[PDB]
Design a protein around this ligand. Structure first.
Ligand SMILES: [Ca+2]
Ligand SMILES: [Ca+2]
Ligand SMILES: [Ca+2]
Length: 221
C-alpha cells in the first residue's frame, strides 16, 4: 500500500499555467515562430530545451542551438516573472495536509527549472517538501513525457512503483507517471479536454485539486 504521493508542480501545486503558456506563446512570436497557447498547454511538463527544439524542428526542420535555447529560455523566464506571482492551486494545501496526516511522504516531480516557483515551495507549503525528495529540471536528461523523472523520484524516496501515486494535470506528465508504472490521478486544471489526460494513461480523472481532496479517502479505501 501507499507510502508516498508524487505531486506535479505547475498546474497542480501552483496556478502558474496561464502565465507559462502566455510567456511561451509570446517569446516564440518574437522569434517569428508559431506556438499557440493551446500548443503550450499540450507541451506542459517538457524541459525548456525540448519545447524549443520541437517548435524549431516542426517549423524550420532544424533544431535550435544551445545559444538559442539559452536565449529563448532566458526571455521566457523574464516574461513569466513580469506577471503577478502564481498563487496556490485551491485544494493543494488541504490535500497535502491530508496526505501528511495519513503518514504519506509528499514529493515534487516537475519539469520546471523556474527558480521563483521552486524557491516558493516551502513558503506556500510549509513543512511538506524536502530537496532530497524532489525531482526538477536539474535532475533529468530527457524529462516528461519520459518516465525518467518519476522513476528518479521512486529511487530518491526508496520506493517501489506500487507504493506511490502520481498527481498530474497535463498529458505529457500523465504519460510520464503511467509509463513509470505508477497509479496516476489526473486533475484537469487547464483548458484541455479531459480525454487527452485519459488518453495519456490516467487511472482516474478529477476536475480539480479540491474535488480530489474531497474524494481522497474514498479512492484510497
Ligand atoms: Ca503540470
Ligand atoms: Ca468536453
Ligand atoms: Ca484508461
Amino acid at each position: 500500500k501507499l507510502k508516498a504521493v508524487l505531486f506535479d508542480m505547475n498546474g497542480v501545486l501552483f496556478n502558474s499555467m496561464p502565465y507559462h503558456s502566455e510567456a511561451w506563446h509570446q517569446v516564440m512570436k518574437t522569434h517569428g515562430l508559431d506556438l499557440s497557447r493551446e500548443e503550450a498547454y499540450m507541451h506542459e511538463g517538457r524541459t525548456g530545451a525540448s519545447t524549443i527544439n520541437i517548435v524549431f524542428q516542426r517549423e524550420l526542420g532544424k533544431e535550435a542551438t544551445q545559444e538559442e535555447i539559452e536565449s529563448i529560455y532566458h526571455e521566457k523566464s523574464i516574461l513569466f516573472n513580469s506577471y503577478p506571482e502564481a498563487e496556490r492551486m485551491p485544494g493543494a494545501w488541504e490535500l497535502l495536509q491530508k496526505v501528511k496526516s495519513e503518514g504519506l511522504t509528499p514529493m515534487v516531480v516537475t519539469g520546471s527549472g523556474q527558480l521563483s516557483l521552486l524557491e516558493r515551495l516551502e513558503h506556500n507549503f510549509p513543512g511538506m517538501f524536502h530537496k532530497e525528495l524532489m525531482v526538477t529540471a536539474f535532475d533529468v536528461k530527457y524529462g516528461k513525457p519520459n518516465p525518467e523523472p518519476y522513476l528518479m523520484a521512486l529511487k530518491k524516496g526508496g520506493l517501489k512503483a506500487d507504493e506511490a501515486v502520481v498527481i498530474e494535470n497535463a498529458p505529457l506528465g500523465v504519460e510520464a507517471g503511467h509509463k513509470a508504472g505508477i497509479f496516476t490521478i489526473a486533475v484537469n486544471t487547464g483548458p484541455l479536454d479531459g480525454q487527452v489526460l485519459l488518453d495519456a494513461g490516467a487511472d482516474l480523472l478529477f476536475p480539480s485539486m479540491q474535488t480530489l481532496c474531497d474524494s481522497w479517502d474514498t479512492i484510497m479505501l
